[PDB]
Scaffold this active site. Sequence first.
Site, short mmCIF file in Angstrom:
data_model
loop_
_atom_site.label_atom_id
_atom_site.label_comp_id
_atom_site.label_asym_id
_atom_site.label_seq_id
_atom_site.Cartn_x
_atom_site.Cartn_y
_atom_site.Cartn_z
N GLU B 357 1.01 -1.18 0.53
CA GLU B 357 0.16 -0.03 -0.14
C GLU B 357 0.74 1.98 0.06
O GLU B 357 -0.30 2.62 -0.28
CB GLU B 357 -0.38 0.04 1.34
CG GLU B 357 -1.97 -1.40 1.18
CD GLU B 357 -3.11 -1.18 0.27
OE1 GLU B 357 -3.55 -0.75 -0.56
OE2 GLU B 357 -3.05 -2.62 -0.48
N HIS B 487 -15.71 -6.97 -7.89
CA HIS B 487 -15.27 -5.86 -9.16
C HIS B 487 -16.99 -5.90 -9.70
O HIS B 487 -16.74 -5.01 -10.69
CB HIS B 487 -14.63 -6.49 -9.99
CG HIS B 487 -12.55 -6.18 -8.86
ND1 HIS B 487 -12.87 -5.67 -7.83
CD2 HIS B 487 -11.52 -7.10 -9.45
CE1 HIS B 487 -11.65 -5.36 -7.36
NE2 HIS B 487 -10.44 -6.33 -8.31
#
EC number: 3.4.17.23
Lengths: 242, 597
Positions: B357, B487
């Site tokens: 991240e 998604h």
Amino acid sequence: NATRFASVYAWNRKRISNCVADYSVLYNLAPFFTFKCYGVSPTKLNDLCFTNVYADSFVIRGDEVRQIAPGQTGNIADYNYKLPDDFTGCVIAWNSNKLDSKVSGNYNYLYRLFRKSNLKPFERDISTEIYQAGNKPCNGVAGFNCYFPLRSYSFRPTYGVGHQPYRVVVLSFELLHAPATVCGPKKSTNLVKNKCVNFNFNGLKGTGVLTESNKKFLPFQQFGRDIADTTDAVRDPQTLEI
Amino acid sequence: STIEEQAKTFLDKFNHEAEDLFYQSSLASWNYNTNITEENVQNMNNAGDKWSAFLKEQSTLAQMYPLQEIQNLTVKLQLQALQQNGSSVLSEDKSKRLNTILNTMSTIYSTGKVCNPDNPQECLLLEPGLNEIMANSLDYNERLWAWESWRSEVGKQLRPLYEEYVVLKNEMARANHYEDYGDYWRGDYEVNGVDGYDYSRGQLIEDVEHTFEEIKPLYEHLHAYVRAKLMNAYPSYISPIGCLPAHLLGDMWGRFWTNLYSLTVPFGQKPNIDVTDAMVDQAWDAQRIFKEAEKFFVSVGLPNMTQGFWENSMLTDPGNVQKAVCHPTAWDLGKGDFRILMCTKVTMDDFLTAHHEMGHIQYDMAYAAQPFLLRNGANEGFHEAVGEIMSLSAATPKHLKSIGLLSPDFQEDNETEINFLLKQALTIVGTLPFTYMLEKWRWMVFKGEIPKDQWMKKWWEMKREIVGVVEPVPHDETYCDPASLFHVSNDYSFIRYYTRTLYQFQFQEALCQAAKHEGPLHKCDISNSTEAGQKLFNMLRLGKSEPWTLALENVVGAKNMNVRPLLNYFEPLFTWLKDQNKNSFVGWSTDWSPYAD
């Protein structure tokens, strides 16, 4: 250290003329975020001074401090303001997370990113011109390949290093053919008496013995002379004493 | 007044509140993920609708005169991300109905409630519940319930809801001078304006097919190795000739193969590489785990971070009174800032996501002075492909010795790195053909060449010849197997995960050719080299001002999408799976079915 500021295209002209500059509380203490500038070093500003000083007040991102440079091109350096090649000032930035910001978006001061052409250095352009890039006119509205310029800030103190409110105060120095009026602080020493010592005063230089004077004088004078045109009197630059 | 002098002035009153109306929905969505109150959800709605109307207010007033008068290359590459009108080219009854069908599609995926029909008196929650019962349940009838019923009560009404959603989605992109909605995900991949490096949207159909031919020897040896180790677990459920059943892949669909690592251990006598037992003795906290991970960013040659990263973002969960959602997402909130919200634990999977991240922070740091249309990836999958280069380099045993993590005298033989590389094979190679058959399923139902009865019959026929799985029960035309994911239900792109594994491998194969590393590429570490950042600094600052074809020229030098970094990263994995597969069946076949008894 103001509580308000201005836009980067609406630069005010803080005309610093006939002043005494005190950099012992601003430069030596340094409460700002970064202290870095080019051209003239900030340690040379106490021993060198200029004719006219101009200042401003504008808050930008932390990404646009690389654009503030002499000879710079890019995003800000040709379309909002331009630093010339003879820039003898310094650029100081400070993070203003607790003062200059505003909750629920900062919708009061505006800035640009592009322009019709390359502006002159220190140009105050506050226009709201209509643009036309193609071959059909726009009659005042935007379009496909027709754009418009004028939008405000996005400041909030809860984020990282990119677009925090950084108050940048560009202290522009200019040396002209006129004599200097605004100069910096210069340290002082103690005063010894009844000894053969050297003199380094505000307008005197020599070697002699300092004794107590018993003559009268005018307070707007720098020195005095005897009947044989020799310097036999000195006024102190701090205290009213000869 | 001259035609050649007028280049670009759009970024004054567009590119300053493209962030700022998204800014008022940025922290309002961030306070939704930290302080779930009754009034911290309402500020997401009224401020997010102002930014949703901002992309449609300027689109209705941009309908005057066409494009072909431009000359500069910097003008056209940002123009493609603004001239998409979106939903504003349909009628009043058709365009606003798309906004209501997207809010009812994400609600039943997150707040679903499905449990056992035999004993429904105790009915459990889905997302913390069914994610962790797949790993420990070694039963055939127990794993049959968690895969079949989830698409039987949640996905039963999406099948009369997805059929008219595809039909309205064709109308918003055919009016945008495109052939379909199938190249709307390929619209970011469209490169125009540079001679010799033209990458059209019709070129991408053969390019995914070109890189899929050489992965078929690599995937079918991993298809025959998990099957051969499930004979002692499942003796009379899985055939050695046919395919594996799809309800035992470890997760809800079979995208990641991460929970099938503990059952397919090659050698059980040696321990796995582990940071979890050595973390509780030295008593680490939240300040240490980002500071030495930011030491990995200085030693390559990227500059330091100031005090705005340490006092704004927190790493600890703020009490047990207030709920804080902690999914790993690097918050790209506009023109180059990152606040990290992560529920950190003493976990190796939490340690590798600290480098993952923060790898999306370092890409957006370099073009922080660039415009917002150029403040993106080179494509949709370019943002997370340059983020996991720091996680595969931190899982290297040569990096853990220089800090002070593991034992200083650790044995490293040829049988040590193979258990690490098959862990990476179910993270990188195990999701690679699963990304292919869903994006090819998206490119076959948008064009409309197939009827309504072949909508779901084409889905289970592709899975027995691409990924090599077979469903245990057959489905009719009222259910949906691919449309129950994260998604697809929230309308996100699925092409971004196929280019995540391709662009990551192209950069790491050449990064320690600058740093002069001799050996395999899983021992490659990019630390203690100041010249390793200079190959990246011209690539980290190019964003969308330069396209992705010229972005690959300074590291690897290949203008096309190639498979050759994916082959010599796994060179013990290609050789040591060959000698153990002398007597088993290579590949799969289209004759075995569990319901054909």
